[PDB]
Design a binder for these strands. Structure first.
Lengths: 695, 695, 79, 79
RNA sequence: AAAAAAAA
């Protein structure tokens, strides 16, 4: 009835299997890809017909993590999986970036690829198996697609590269990089790193690109027998005559406008050329259409900018390939916030703020590889006034979550260990103006806001957004690229890092033939510029300050005996409630003795510090104890001796095996010399009273 | 490179700092306004071109409270981030209402104002600072706007008015009137009051209007050096002939038709005339636009009704200036809910219901100013069938939150204090028909539903909406304006109060030249009309009565030794779940020594009291129990004996000495006779295995 | 002025009361239906003119459980 | 899975150690919520079979011996 | 000893 086709190949130490034809037979193609007990089901459905008047390729990628894949019922009140998480949206972006540029030019049919995680081995991460899955699904479908891609996560254990590291190994790794490539060239790189040197990162990318050849060979083998016939699609014929007709009229004039050098006079000059040339021949036979004309005019603009940059020295803004827009940097701009800074690159402004908190306010994010609690929170706001448009604010789009993640990778490598800084820290970066690359203006600002709040950060960090143009063998690397020159970049990349060593590299490639030395000079030029930005920031704030003091929560640490803390948590743990209500202060649950005191001022902290040492008087070695007799009855005398446990006297006696009598030395409330060197009965260390006799 | 313009003046005690040019340079204007460490960043972005479909003005105002202001991590579990709520939406409406009238007629270009709170001093409210901020931003851009508007919150303490009261001052105050006004006149008033006479409320509006003069003068001085050149905008030219042709064939045949008393009959006549004029236009329609002809027709209608109302006695429905619509009031209409009332004022009809609950079910509002718990909740539901239309129902719009808040101000003045009414109270109003002013029908309904459920309100309250029509030297004040008659009103206002004293007041003004001498008669006519509604309302329910017979929750507060209550909490709340569930009533966990036994009858209250007595009590003498070994302690034990708690036999304890070494009882199934013995301070109570009677 | 018209019949040992004319007069019809102290208010609004270009029949049914019907304030954070 | 075994109604005392201290270590080491039970019907709540069998093996090991205050051929393992 | 209801 139904027969599955299975191919099994060895990637690293994990057997990986592709299963096809078994499920979802009405979708254009579908594959279950399984790698060492983690499995994801990936399916592509592509429209057969072009929706008329579409001028942008509509590609949808959906990635979703069903909780039944871990064997757990969802925590939500509904007990059902909700809207896609931040983490899931980011994984979808990782699949989309290497796929979108690989479809042929002028392909505009609707395409949707859905990846569902269906089972998870906690040790094996589902994303690197999802990327192979999308590559398999697209290459098996008839859809016009320029060859399969692999994917490989490379780590850096003990100065060795280790392909596809398992989750525990990442604890002691200094690098986590995700290469995706075809057989000809790399297509994208994403990473976080504990300040590695440049050549170690480029070495990891050249390594990962070779280990992916196994997947490329294996998907090509599967498509030989189990693939659908490629449905024939031919790009719509270009009108050579129309392109020549519009060129004679505007090419020389548009070139002249770019030769004119200004922020806005070139703009106005281009507009008068565009408006007239569009008007001319607009009414001639009614052949001209707004879509037909606008596209050719923008295409001529892109041609004159590319050709001008590869040869003519001036860029659109007039700075040379190695120059960065002017800096202006300001600290403590907001009142009554824990720490704040404004970083301006001249047309990119990031107002960024760091707020501290007690451990209670840390996030507890539950996911398939296990619940974990993180103490560093990064949020990136891109409000619509920042690019001069009007739109609904509402909730963040994928790019805001993408940029918020990349900036977090940049700073995370320089944050202090929780043992020497116990507070949770949230950084919110609010973009106020955006014409450059605003994610890298966020990293610089975040390092200022953190060290202004007086977190002991390990070093200053800064970012640079860069582009490469390689129409011919000649290439030019461009530093601090404007947003308005995205189309000019044949590759573009971001190089967030420190005075020495790189923190987070991200790189998306759109052209064939980028060999390793063309990456090497491009991020050597990136090291140059990053150092210049770092130099200006050291003059604004050289080192971290002592503390925020703007109603900053204060935390204090002290080591107390495990027995004394158990009694402060005595009566079932009720004893701790008696303290927290009196001092407005939480005491934390390290029962092995590392007491944390946390409070909103420098008094209730000190009151709690006085109270913990005051209220517990349990010592088993002890000393002569001038405690006060409460009852001198048989079965041992009762004596007031203080905190912890008040010991009862050793059995039937006062001291010396009941040499004396209860009637002898009888009064209430009297000071007597107690000592606590006895047996541990009723769960109490017993005691005795050395009154001119001794046991 | 960058330096701000800075302008600081003194408003009342605080110092206001206006700061410009430093941030968001691509928005049409942006201003950082700071008042005693509370700071809000406010920006306006306005599209220069107009969309050629718009026949209304799209102005959008967003107010948002970043919780990084005042240094705290967001409570929301998901992503530690927030979305717009009631508290923010009401502040957006307070900025919106004064700005819309000032913008010139025919200005249809889209405009967006975004106001972000970036720091809060909890003594100074952010709302007043924002209204100055939006006024500065709009007046500083070139957007055509008629003058800056200052704002002013006016408190009232020991019969002295105080400007911008701090939170500490306000709590003691008897009014909280907001006023916003240009140099010529007031433009908006919003206020709650502890039942003050009309002359005290009018005194506040004039006083606040005069203190705002400093803000208006200062904003002009800033615009004199930092301001943009005003962008040219001309109202679209109006063709007198196009208006004249429709006017000639309408006004006479509409003046007679407005005379017809029946609403449906007149509606059918005017619609027929309208179609006939459209037919008369014939070739070329009206500039080839039916809409243009319709606009002229609506205008001719508005002019005839307005001119008629201020020259002649009859209104659209044949009523005079001082005739409130026919009143039909019916209490207790719903079964098995704690209190309900249907209030019908002519066509506007409101079904209102009151429900009581335990203090536990109060909501916790995490406002930027500080966390607070309110015990009184008002919810206003406006379903689309109330208008006779079809539409969605699910999510409340801005107006439902606006009206819900105004209705809450009406009743909040007359609620009993929690220290003689220990319940949370929720009022839900369902507007079942809405021709007229629905929100003030909701206040009456709420005042009947509350005093029907038996809450002892301080007096009955009621409300009315009113309109002023004003020309070159004369004006008419109309009572109970209908929805259709709002277009003729130049001023409209709503008043809610008891037999003596205004409780809430709201005014919006659309024209200059209204004055204290007009408002003096307008509120006196309101005192007349309100005092009639109170009499009809009084007949249905004269005074608050007893509590609901059965459905209402009743509270019992039995006193228990709180250490035993703490043990009944168990491992932080695990046994009490069963106890509340088996009773099926909301018995509380409060450990203060007052156990809340809340139940819907006396039987479940007594069952719960007996259930807590079973687990808390220990028999003081009992019998010679054959106690059986239940547990191990450290050299200790727990023995089952009479009452809810086990006793301990320490191994040595049968006669205060080891007369018979007691090792043999130290195992299960021995069950040897014991007798009750003393309770010690430690909590390990004394027990001994002795047949002899022990006390 | 205003008064309902009421019909009461016995269905399966529960008295059922049909009550009309008192509320939602603006909507095309409204009928408070009650069966032994469980009560639901039901209203229908229909457009008098058919929108040109419609082919299918757009019927929308909305059922709502207000929690004030059971005497309890809501469990939701926003109340 | 929830696992349950009978262990002798005296030697059960030795499973627990002095108070909660050894219970913390055993629950932390095995990743199981093993509770204190005087009856000896020790309940070892677990999230999978591996954690259950790991907890069964350690509770078997650390209380495997009958104290009758008798003679043992006890080998000195550490001075 | 492992201590009191809060579905953002």
């Amino acid at each position: 009835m139904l027969n599955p086709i299975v191919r099994k190949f060895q990637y690293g130490q994990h057997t990986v299997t592709l299963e096809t034809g078994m499920m979802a037979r009405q979708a254009t193609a579908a594959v279950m890809v399984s790698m060492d007990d983690t499995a994801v089901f990936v399916t592509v459905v592509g429209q057969k017909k072009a929706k008329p008047g579409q001028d942008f390729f509509p590609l949808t990628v959906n990635y979703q993590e069903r909780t039944y894949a871990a064997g757990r019922i969802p925590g939500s009140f509904f007990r059902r999986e909700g809207r896609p998480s931040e983490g899931e949206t980011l994984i979808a972006r990782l699949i989309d970036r290497p796929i979108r540029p690989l479809f042929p030019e002028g392909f505009v049919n609707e395409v949707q690829v859905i990846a569902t995680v269906v089972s998870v081995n906690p040790q094996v991460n589902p994303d690197i198996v999802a990327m192979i899955g999308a590559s398999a699904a697209l290459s098996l479908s008839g859809i016009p697609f320029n060859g399969p891609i692999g994917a490989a996560r490379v780590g850096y254990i003990n100065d060795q590269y280790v392909l596809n590291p398992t989750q525990d190994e990442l604890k002691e790794s200094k690098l986590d990089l995700v290469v995706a490539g075809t057989e000809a060239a790399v297509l994208m790189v994403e990473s976080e790193a504990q300040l590695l040197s440049e050549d170690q990162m480029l070495g990891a990318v050249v390594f990962g690109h070779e280990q992916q050849q196994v997947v490329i060979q294996n998907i090509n083998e599967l498509v030989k027998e189990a693939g659908k016939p490629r449905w024939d699609w031919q790009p719509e014929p270009v009108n050579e005559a129309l392109n020549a007709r519009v060129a004679a009229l505007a090419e020389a004039r548009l070139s002249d406008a770019y030769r004119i050098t200004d922020k806005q006079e070139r703009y106005a000059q281009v507009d008068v050329i565009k408006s007239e040339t569009i008007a001319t021949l607009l009414a001639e036979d009614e052949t001209l259409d707004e879509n037909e004309l606008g596209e050719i005019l923008h295409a001529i603009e892109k041609n004159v900018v590319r050709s001008r940059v590869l040869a003519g020295e001036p860029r659109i803004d007039g700075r040379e390939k190695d120059m960065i827009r002017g800096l202006d940097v300001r600290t403590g701009v907001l009142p009554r916030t824990h720490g704040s800074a404004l970083f301006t690159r001249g047309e990119t402004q990031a107002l960024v703020t760091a707020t501290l908190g007690t451990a209670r306010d840390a996030q507890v994010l539950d996911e398939l590889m296990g619940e974990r609690t993180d103490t560093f929170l990064f949020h990136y706001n891109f409000p619509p006034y920042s690019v001069g448009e009007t739109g609904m604010v509402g909730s963040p789009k994928r790019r805001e979550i993408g940029h918020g993640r990349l900036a977090k990778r940049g700073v995370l490598a320089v944050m202090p260990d929780m043992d020497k800084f116990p507070y949770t820290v949230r950084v919110v970066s609010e973009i106020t103006e955006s014409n450059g690359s605003s994610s890298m203006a966020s990293v610089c600002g975040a390092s200022l806001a953190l060290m202004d709040a007086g977190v002991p950060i390990k070093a200053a960090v800064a970012g640079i957004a860069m582009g490469l143009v390689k129409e011919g063998d000649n290439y030019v690397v461009l530093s601090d690229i404007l947003g308005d020159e995205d189309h000019l970049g044949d590759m573009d990349f971001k190089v967030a890092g420190s005075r020495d060593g790189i923190s987070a590299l991200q790189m998306d490639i759109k052209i064939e033939g980028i060999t390793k030395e063309i990456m090497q000079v491009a991020l050597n030029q990136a090291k140059g510029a990053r150092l210049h930005i770092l130099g200006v920031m050291e003059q604004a704030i050289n080192a971290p300050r002592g503390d925020i003091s703007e109603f900053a929560p204060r935390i204090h640490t002290i080591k107390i005996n495990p027995d004394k803390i158990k009694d402060v948590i005595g009566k079932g743990g009720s004893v701790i409630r008696a303290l927290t209500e009196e001092t407005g202060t939480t005491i934390e649950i390290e029962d092995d003795g590392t007491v944390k005191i946390a409070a909103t001022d420098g008094e209730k902290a000190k009151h709690a510090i006085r109270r913990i040492e005051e209220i517990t008087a349990e010592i088993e070695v002890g000393r002569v104890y001038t405690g006060k007799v409460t009852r001198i009855v048989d079965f041992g005398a009762f004596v007031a001796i203080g905190g912890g446990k008040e010991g009862l006297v050793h059995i039937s006696q006062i001291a010396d095996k009941r040499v004396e009598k209860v009637t002898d030395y009888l009064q209430m409330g009297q000071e007597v010399p107690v000592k606590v060197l006895e047996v541990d009965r009723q769960g109490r260390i017993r005691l005795s009273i050395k009154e001119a006799t001794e046991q």
